[PDB]
Amino acid sequence: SREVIPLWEDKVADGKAWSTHVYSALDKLGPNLLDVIPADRSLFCPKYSSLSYAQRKQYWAFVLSSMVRFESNFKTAMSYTQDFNDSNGNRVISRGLLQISIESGNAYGCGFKSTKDLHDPLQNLSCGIRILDRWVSRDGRIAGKVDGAWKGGARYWSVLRAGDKTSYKSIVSWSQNLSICK
């Protein structure tokens, strides 16, 4: 049985299927994410190095759900226009559960064929996994600004950037107080 259940199982009717998908997608798209022992585990998850593969998948599904909470409050339809342009000269639009944009997402190999695909929560979560798989494994840590540079998931998501704000403080607190982490 699972020891940790993601927050979207409490909030959305389809949350259990989101979890099922995320566990599968972590296997396939997050093999590097699941192999990292992050340098900021003492902050996010003190017992991380003791976690089994299955427990790491439960951990990451939970953390993803906390990011979704603060990026979109679990609203897959969310569409927020940013100030900057993309390669066509149109303003970037952040979409879906993790507020990813199509040009940036596709650079990670997410293969969104249409803007509508980012509003598919499963595709959106898979892309989030690809982004974490890239940066957490490259940088060897979950977040933080180290020697002038944002690292891990904080390269992409504001909610993972340390500051005196509700999103970051909640994500860190909820993570470090998971029974498997503490």
Author numbering: 73 to 254
Anything the authors wrote about it?
Here, we discover a family of Bdellovibrio proteins that define a new subgrouping of the lysozyme superfamily and demonstrate that they possess outright specificity for deacetylated peptidoglycan. We solve the structure of family member Bd0314 (that we named DslA), revealing adaptations to the lysozyme fold that sterically restrict the active-site cleft into only accepting polymers deacetylated at the GlcNAc positions. We determine a role for DslA in B. bacteriovorus exit from the prey cell and demonstrate that exogenously added enzyme is able to prematurely liberate predators from prey bdelloplasts before completion of the predatory lifecycle. The architecture of DslA is related to, but significantly different from, other members of the lysozyme superfamily but still fulfil the inclusion criteria for the lysozyme superfamily noted by Monzingo et al. — conservation of the β-sheet floor and helices D and F, with appropriate placement of acidic catalytic residues.
Large crystals of a catalytic E154Q mutant enabled us to solve the structure via Sulfur-SAD phasing, finding two disulfides and two methionine residues, tracing residues 74–254 inclusive. The fold is comprised of seven major α-helices (A-G), several smaller 310 helices, an elongated β-hairpin (b1–2) and a smaller β-hairpin (b3-4). The fold is stabilized by disulfide bonds between C117:C253 and C182:C199. A second acidic residue, E154 projects upward from the β-sheet floor of the cleft, and its conformation is stabilized by a hydrogen bond to S166 and packing effects mediated by the hydrophobic sidechains of Y152 and F156. The pose of E154 is further influenced by interruption of main chain hydrogen-bonding: the backbone carbonyl groups of E154 and D155 point downward, not participating in β-hairpin formation. The net effect creates a bulge and allows the sidechain of E154 to face upward, directly across from E143. All four of our DslA structures (two wild-type, E143Q, E154Q) are highly similar, other than a relatively small flexation of the β1–2 hairpin in the E154Q variant. Variants E143Q and E154Q clearly fold and retain a similar active-site architecture (as judged by our high-resolution structures herein), but display no notable activity (middle), confirming their participation in catalysis. Residue E143 of the conserved ES motif would act as a general acid, protonating the equatorial linkage between MurNAc and GlcN, with E154 acting as a general base to activate water to attack the MurNAc C1 in an axial orientation. The structural equivalence of DslA E154 to the β1 secondary catalytic acid residues of goose-type lysozymes (also GH23, but with a second catalytic residue lacking in the lytic transglycosylases), v-type lysozymes and chitosanases, and our assay on the E143Q and E154Q mutants argues for an inverting hydrolytic mechanism for DslA.
